[PDB]
């Protein structure tokens, strides 16, 4: 049987990061954690492409362009939703969840979810200190595994050629 | 500033693995943990050199050989010490720690400590089937980071020459 | 009479700093203090050599490398050990105490002990702000004196020649 | 991947047996146990080398010579530490354990602890009969295992060269 | 029989003195007593080498240089450890014992142990008056005797030569 | 089976003796104890060598000198430690204990531990008495048995050639 998955090497890969700037105290935390696991897993940072946006709403629209550049292999979602504004949390979080979903299925490119849905800002003051449970860290890793996967999937597509 | 830190790509490295066979219900579990983090951090699995021995006692006399090979860049300590005979847990666990340490200083070669000090066997059974808590995975990681750090130390020496 | 001592100038000198990343909450604070004393007490930071590692275990093996390079005059050992796991604070801390010791005596090179043994994060914060008690600050001072002292030993050796 | 472990046939091998002559009441039972499994796991007994000495103290210095012969492959250790004299029991048992440990690392030649640490004459007699626990028996077994493991080690290096 | 012991004449001998300046109120008391007995037993005070360091920790690394001079026949260990920091008194004091021990055994050059272990400062001040428990007085005298002894040992070798 | 042990005939052997002169109230007794067992076991005394030092501390460095001469076959530790100060009895007894041990493994020369570690002055009165348990008598004999043994080891090596 033929198995496919990705090792976690960030070698030869160019990454995408989008991030809100609502609640930037904790977003500072997540951006770091992602960028680390990139670079410390071999990634060079000159090809990480990073976009800020105002609020959670605009995360889709931006990622949509980011994934459409040829040279961005995977794109890392980053946004923060604490239960501040409830209609905007149920509708916008499910609409971004879905929105990202369609972007990937359509564009044929992995998009990770580094979106901290903290019911309680008390969970946010826990990781803003020093804890490594850094959702940016780990969603960044999943993006690498996908990245090397579709690098591995489509490489066996075009080298067998 | 000159900063040296370990990046986690196991690319091009040849690992040393030393294993006890006392309590192998869980040692088989740990060695898996090490090999996985190894290859799934980009290292190849043909250049892993694995050795087993009766009990934790000969762990040192083992690695003393493996580390003297020029083509093994790091040695991973593996064993399980469950509190079986207190003469053997206080004195042998202390001799493992002290013994492996002196090898490392002496050969100038990173040796990792994957020894599980569990108080009983039921904790050993729990960790081999309920969580990724896998001390082998992690001693496998620290030797990777040391492998690139020392290959960063001595190679920043050798090419700058 | 002939008396040898060392002033507190960091001029003409190249230092080593070894850093663990366990409990990094406090490590940021102490390496900061350490680099404060060097550059403020006459040193330029261009020859401060900073090597980082996982946990307290790997401290020795690193400094032993920093001491085998010709142009590192003193190495500032820095890490935090907190009473987590009694197996690891007793045996690992004395193995650091001893391991560093026999390093310097063998290599004939001063290595100082900036290892804060604390029981609470609050004991770390107290020492981080302004209480002039950053123990890395002091370890940086002691090593400066030893560096200029050994520069005073070795230079009064080669100049009288 | 390459695996090394250890088979139990003692053929082609030449052993070292070092033994105290204090408490020889139970020592007679172990010496027989040792040469029992050697001859009985295929070894001939003409190449067994038996050195007797005063008390558990002289154990190391003797083994030091036995391992320094080319045609002695493994040095099985035989001594009894019954709680007679407590300063001699803690200080000399840990110093035998340590002194042996360093001997094996230094000479890169396997050494086995066939030393029965008993608090009573009752525990000494029980296992010295036929209850599967004649510590000389397992000492000689693990020693054969490291003999074929090391001959598997260095002979897999020297023959693959 | 061939017996060797040393007289106490300080004539023709060049000494080492290492001094911690932790607790200097009594340390000055000591070195006075030291150089006193040296000079009174006929030896000139210009061949004294006196080295100053911070706290008890560096005591080793200083002497290690002092001995590697061809022209220092013996070295006088001088420092005071008062129970200030008990982790620092167990590890530093014992490490002073061992570290100095092994330097002397290694260089085959004697190092005395002018170490005052006081719990209370009053027991210090009481012992430097005229009864000459001025521990430096005695550690100085031991160094003289050992000095003449190794000059008695090796010189009964090189002149009989 | 190849067996090595030793007769007790001191014919042809040249011995080493180191003696502390602290508490000479017992040291004279033991010193003579060894000389007796030597010559009354056939050995001449023009080949015995006695060195005297201040205290228990210096016995290591001396034996290291005595064992390095070509014409000394075995060395006799001699000292009495009375519990005068717990820093000096615990540290100096274990430090000389191990210290002598490592000398022997290192110089490949047998050292007997001719120490009387008495917790009280009464135990000091028991062991230098009439019952022919004169620790010097005994450790002298252990040295002769080990002297003829390593003469049996190295002779069964050198003459078989």
Author numbering:
A (entry chain 0X), B (entry chain 0A), C (entry chain 0B), D (entry chain 0E), E (entry chain 0C), F (entry chain 0D): 1 to 161
Structure paper excerpt:
One highly versatile encapsulation system has been engineered from the capsid-forming enzyme lumazine synthase from the hyperthermophilic bacterium Aquifex aeolicus.
The 3D classification, followed by refinement using 9,900 particles, resulted in an EM map resolved to 5.2 Å resolution. Like its evolutionary parent, AaLS-13 has a highly porous cage structure constructed exclusively from pentameric building blocks, but, in contrast to AaLS-neg, it adopts icosahedral symmetry. The 39-nm wide, ∼6-MDa large sphere is assembled from 72 pentamers (360 subunits), twice as many as AaLS-neg. The AaLS-13 cage architecture can be best viewed as an extended dodecahedron, the dual counterpart of an icosahedron, with each face consisting of a central pentamer surrounded by five others (12 × 30-mer). In contrast, the AaLS-13 assembly is not skewed, and its porous surface avoids offending contacts that could arise when a pentamer is packed inside a pseudohexagonal hole. A remarkable feature of the negatively supercharged AaLS assemblies is that roughly 30% of the protomers (48/180 for AaLS-neg and 120/360 for AaLS-13) lack inter-pentamer interactions, leaving large pores in the shell wall.
